[PDB]
């Protein structure tokens, strides 16, 4: 599952509720240190409410397993990620994903 | 046919090339060389601490660099660019190496969890003490004097290595070696030495930037000559017998 | 003993600087004893002690002197910045003197004047350097513009040393002359170790020390008078890497033919260490050889399944990473991945077989040499075995092993494709 790992946690208890834009500023990663995604290079913090199934539930479950201002190393898996299908052209089949997640605000 | 063969040509992805721009970093060391030749060994146990002030991305990417875990220069060299392991011209680059940056050791982009409670990066006002272990390599360090267990075996110390510290831009740190300049908040533990015994004469020790080829010259392009180290002969001091 | 040098415990304190010998110290630790020593040996001269020193031409014994060729950094400028026409002039100062040579190279470890791709000369010896030795000009020292220049049209390579036009034994201006322009000449600055230089291409006429004397009125241009940019320079490098298909070795060739087969080998005495790195990672129990002739140790080989990172090509053989998990105790754990073949081998017995699935057995000639490591997180390898021989047919190079390099399945016969080199 989402084997969350903290980096620089803040209050540690401001967990996200339903209909709360997790203002995530992550830097998506793969195994081997091969980058596949980034929000810091964009300067566009990722935003998603809970439950609506925009992102893979790695982000949803990790965010739910996460507080405000919590820099964390998320670890998604192929079951929750694109899996044996893979986002084509970028992601191959059967991939384990990593995210330098850092939730900031909830609106 | 264009859209068909577009969406046929894209999903191969062994054709699809990859590029990854990386920050330019810089290694550093004090003027002390190890030079610990067995037979007339002066010390086998050193100790120094690295105090810090700022490690944040001020106008930059958060992918910074600040490491201290000693690398194998029999496998590493101080060049400003190169290496198939995503670059990062600093400490812990070569596979025959590690590097301590608060939570982990990255032996050639192979994550190795170092055992310590409250794993956190080299954040503001977090000291990083150094310790030496050679004969059975379990090279201790400590971050604010807490047990950084799970130390590294089979780091190639066949002979010696070098004292190192790496730092990206947006960094503000201080050595702690001795005298006024080492205000040892955590002293050398039993069987260690505050690493200023080899304050050799003729010069006050200082940084070296890991034998740089050319600093930011301004007058004219100074072709600074080839120097390997303090001695062109070898890496060793002279106990006369 | 460990007089204050017991590294672990230090039962007693007051370690001194004297532990490092009187080389580290000076005579200040020695004024007390050396005067009595000198009194003693003074009266030993009062005995009649006759003892001349050994390291003196009279008692001719000094035979420990020789040079040191290493890291001869050949500073250059860019091939894009090369010149083919018009007069050109760049100053080269000198901080030191020694095995340091400057002039104009050509696009072509072998230093200036070793071959037909440069023109230079030395201050250490005052002699031209183009494919041999030839006296010219005069030596120099620290604080000396060499004042390198060329006229590319009628081939007048001159060197204006602080305005002092340097001349050959005949007393003529031109050092080098009647040289084909070809593919242009670039400024160049050889420096052996402990030899320093500082060059001013054309970045500022004020920084050009002695240019109005001999560069301005002679029509001789700075090398970067028009460059509104930081001109580039670079060096012959230290680590060896892979860029080039040589095909111009002392004698080594490359071909392919069917089990696969190639053609190889030199006859020059290959005492030194060679290199190899295959270009194409080919892919269509998994017995595929990498043969080389000098087998049953004409010279002892050192087969090792080994990754990219080296820094040497030398006889320092058998000088090559282990996870160790703590649990807030220091006692290690999880030590299964570690050190992330023998020196026996080949072509009297025949081969160096690759095998694949994870599962590798890289031994010579199918005899169990106790292959230890099956560590493979990821390794894009090409077969780079380097060793010596007595030079008999010095080298060679031969689903199958062409199965763990690309996406298709293991399959034995590799098919015809246009790149295989």
From Swiss-Prot, chain A:
What GO CC annotations are associated with the protein? Answer: calcium channel complex; cytoplasm; membrane; sarcoplasmic reticulum membrane; Z disc
Q: How is its activity regulated?
A: Inhibited by both FK506 and rapamycin.
* Reactions that this protein is recorded to catalyse: [protein]-peptidylproline (omega=180) = [protein]-peptidylproline (omega=0)
Q: Which residues cross the membrane?
A: none
GO molecular function terms listed in the Swiss-Prot or TrEMBL record = calcium channel inhibitor activity; calcium channel regulator activity; FK506 binding; peptidyl-prolyl cis-trans isomerase activity; signaling receptor binding; transmembrane transporter binding
Q: What is its main location?
A: cytoplasm
Keywords of the record: Cytoplasm, Isomerase, Rotamase, Sarcoplasmic reticulum
Q: What highest taxon heads this organism's lineage?
A: Eukaryota
- Renumbered to this chain, the signal peptide range is none
Please give the SUPFAM superfamilies that the UniProt record associates with this protein.
FKBP-like
The EC code for this enzyme is 5.2.1.8
UniProt keyword annotation of Magnesium present: no
* Tissue expression pattern: Detected in heart muscle (at protein level). Isoform 1 and isoform 2 are ubiquitous with highest levels in brain and thymus.
Top EC class, one word: isomerase
Q: Which GO terms describe its biological process?
A: 'de novo' protein folding; calcium-mediated signaling; insulin secretion involved in cellular response to glucose stimulus; negative regulation of calcium-mediated signaling; negative regulation of heart rate; negative regulation of insulin secretion involved in cellular response to glucose stimulus; negative regulation of release of sequestered calcium ion into cytosol; neuronal action potential propagation
PROSITE patterns per record:
FKBP_PPIASE (PS50059)
Q: Show the InterPro entries listed in the entry.
A: FKBP-type_PPIase, PPIase_dom_sf, PPIase_FKBP_dom
| Ranges of residues in domain PPIase FKBP-type | 19-107
Q: Where in the cell is it found?
A: Cytoplasm; Sarcoplasmic reticulum
- Spell out the subunit comment: Identified in a complex composed of RYR2, FKBP1B, PKA catalytic subunit, PRKAR2A, AKAP6, and the protein phosphatases PP2A and PP1. Interacts directly with RYR2.
- Indicate the family of this protein: Belongs to the FKBP-type PPIase family. FKBP1 subfamily.
Summarize the protein's role: Has the potential to contribute to the immunosuppressive and toxic effects of FK506 and rapamycin. PPIases accelerate the folding of proteins. It catalyzes the cis-trans isomerization of proline imidic peptide bonds in oligopeptides.
Q: Indicate what this protein is called per its UniProt record.
A: Peptidyl-prolyl cis-trans isomerase FKBP1B
Source organism (scientific name) = Homo sapiens (Human)
Gene expressing this chain: FKBP1B
Swiss-Prot record, chain C:
Q: Can you tell which superkingdom this protein's organism belongs to?
A: Eukaryota
Domain spans labelled B30.2/SPRY: 12-206
Q: How is it modified after translation?
A: Channel activity is modulated by phosphorylation. Phosphorylation is increased in failing heart, leading to calcium leaks and increased cytoplasmic Ca(2+) levels.
Result of knocking out the encoding gene: Embryonically lethal. Embryos die at about 10 dpc, due to defects in heart tube development. Cardiac myotubes display enlarged rough endoplasmic reticulum and cytoplasmic vesicles that contain high levels of Ca(2+).
- Where does this one sit in the cell? Sarcoplasmic reticulum membrane
> Could you give the subunit structure recorded for this chain?
Homotetramer. Can also form heterotetramers with RYR1 and RYR3. Interacts with CALM and S100A1; these interactions regulate channel activity. Identified in a complex composed of RYR2, FKBP1B, PKA catalytic subunit, PRKAR2A, AKAP6, and the protein phosphatases PP2A and PP1. Interacts directly with FKBP1B, PKA, PP1 and PP2A. Interacts with FKBP1A and FKBP1B; these interactions may stabilize the channel in its closed state and prevent Ca(2+) leaks. Interacts with SELENON. Identified in a complex, composed of FSD2, CMYA5 and RYR2.
| Domain writeup | The calcium release channel activity resides in the C-terminal region while the remaining part of the protein resides in the cytoplasm.
Q: What does this protein do?
A: Cytosolic calcium-activated calcium channel that mediates the release of Ca(2+) from the sarcoplasmic reticulum into the cytosol and thereby plays a key role in triggering cardiac muscle contraction. Aberrant channel activation can lead to cardiac arrhythmia. In cardiac myocytes, calcium release is triggered by increased Ca(2+) cytosolic levels due to activation of the L-type calcium channel CACNA1C. The calcium channel activity is modulated by formation of heterotetramers with RYR3. Required for cellular calcium ion homeostasis. Required for embryonic heart development.
Q: What does the similarity note say?
A: Belongs to the ryanodine receptor (TC 1.A.3.1) family. RYR2 subfamily.
Spell out the protein name for this chain.
Ryanodine receptor 2
Natural source organism: Mus musculus (Mouse)
Write the lineage as a comma-separated list: Eukaryota, Metazoa, Chordata, Craniata, Vertebrata
Tell me the gene name.
Ryr2
């Amino acid at each position: 599952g989402v084997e969350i790992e903290t980096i620089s946690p803040g209050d540690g208890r401001t967990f996200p509720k339903k209909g709360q834009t997790c203002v995530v500023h992550y830097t998506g990663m793969l195994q081997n240190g091969k980058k596949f995604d980034s929000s810091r290079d964009r300067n566009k913090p990722f935003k998603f409410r809970i439950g609506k199934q925009e992102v893979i539930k790695g982000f949803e479950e990790g965010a739910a397993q996460m507080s405000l201002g919590q820099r964390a190393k998320l670890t998604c898996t192929p079951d929750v990620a694109y899996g044996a299908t893979g986002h084509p052209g970028v992601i191959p089949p059967n991939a384990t994903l990593i995210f330098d997640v850092e939730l900031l605000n909830l609106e | 046919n264009q859209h068909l063969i577009c969406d046929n040509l894209l999903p191969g992805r062994d054709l699809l090339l990859q590029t990854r721009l990386v920050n330019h970093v810089s290694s550093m060391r004090p003027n002390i060389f190890l030079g610990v030749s067995e037979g007339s060994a002066q010390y086998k146990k050193w100790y120094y601490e690295l105090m810090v002030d700022h490690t944040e991305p001020f106008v930059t990417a958060e992918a910074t660099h600040l490491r201290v875990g000693w690398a194998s220069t029999e496998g590493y060299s101080p060049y400003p660019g190169g290496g198939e392991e995503w670059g990062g011209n600093g400490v812990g680059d070569d596979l025959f190496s590690y590097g301590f940056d608060g939570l982990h050791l990255w032996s050639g982009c192979i994550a190795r969890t170092v055992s310590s409670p409250n794993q956190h990066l080299l954040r503001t006002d977090d000291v990083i003490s150094c310790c030496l272990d050679l004969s059975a390599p379990s090279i201790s360090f400590r971050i604010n004097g807490q047990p950084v267990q799970g130390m590294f075996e089979n780091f190639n110390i066949d002979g010696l290595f070098f004292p190192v510290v790496s730092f990206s831009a947006g960094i503000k740190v201080r050595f702690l070696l001795g005298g006024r300049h080492g205000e040892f908040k955590f002293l050398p533990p039993p069987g260690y030495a505050a690493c200023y015994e080899a304050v050799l004469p003729k010069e006050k020790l200082k940084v070296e930037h890991s034998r740089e080829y050319k600093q930011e010259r301004t007058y004219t392009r100074d072709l600074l000559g080839p120097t390997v180290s303090l001695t062109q002969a070898a890496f060793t001091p002279v106990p006369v017998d | 003993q460990g007089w204050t040098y017991g590294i672990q415990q230090d039962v007693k304190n007051r370690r001194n600087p004297r532990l490092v010998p009187y080389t580290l110290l000076d005579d200040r630790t020695k004024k007390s004893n050396k005067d009595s020593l000198r009194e003693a040996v003074r009266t030993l001269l009062g005995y009649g002690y006759h003892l001349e020193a050994p390291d003196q031409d009279h008692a001719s014994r000094a035979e420990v002197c020789s040079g040191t060729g290493e890291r001869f950094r050949i500073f250059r400028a860019e091939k894009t910045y090369a010149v083919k026409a018009g007069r050109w002039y760049f100053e080269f100062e000198a901080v030191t003197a020694g095995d340091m040579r400057v002039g104009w190279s050509r696009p072509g470890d072998l230093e200036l004047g070793s071959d037909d791709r440069a023109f230079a000369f030395d201050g250490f010896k005052a002699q031209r350097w183009h494919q041999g030795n030839e006296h010219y000009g005069r030596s120099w020292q620290a604080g000396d513009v060499v004042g390198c220049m060329v006229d590319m049209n009628e081939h007048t390579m001159m060197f204006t040393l602080n305005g002092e036009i340097l001349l050959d034994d005949s007393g003529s201006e031109l050092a080098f002359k009647d040289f084909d322009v070809g593919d242009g000449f670039i400024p160049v600055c050889s420096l052996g170790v402990a030899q320093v230089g500082r060059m001013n291409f054309g970045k500022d006429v004020s920084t050009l020390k002695y240019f109005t004397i001999c560069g301005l009125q002679e029509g001789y241009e700075p090398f970067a008078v028009n460059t509104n940019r930081d001109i580039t320079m670079w060096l012959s490098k230290r680590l060896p890497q892979f860029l080039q298909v040589p095909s111009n070795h002392e004698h080594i060739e490359v071909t392919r033919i069917d089990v696969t087969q190639k053609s190889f080998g030199s006859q020059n005495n290959n005492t030194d260490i060679m290199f190899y790195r295959l270009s194409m990672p080919i892919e269509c129990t998994y017995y595929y050889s990498v043969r080389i002739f000098p087998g049953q140790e004409p010279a002892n080989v050192w087969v090792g399944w080994i990754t990219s990172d080296f820094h040497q090509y030398d006889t320092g053989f058998d000088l090559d990473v282990t996870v160790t998990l703590g649990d807030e105790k220091g006692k290690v754990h999880e030590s299964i991945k570690r050190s992330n073949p023998g020196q026996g081998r080949n072509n009297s017995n025949g081969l160096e077989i690759g095998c694949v699935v994870g599962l590798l057995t890289f031994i010579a000639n199918g005899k169990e040499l106790s292959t230890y490591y099956q560590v493979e997180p990821s390794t894009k390898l090409f077969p780079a075995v380097f060793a010596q021989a007595t030079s008999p047919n010095v080298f060679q190079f031969e689903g199958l092993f062409k199965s763990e390099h690309k996406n298709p399945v293991p399959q034995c016969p590799p098919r015809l494709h246009v790149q295989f080199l």
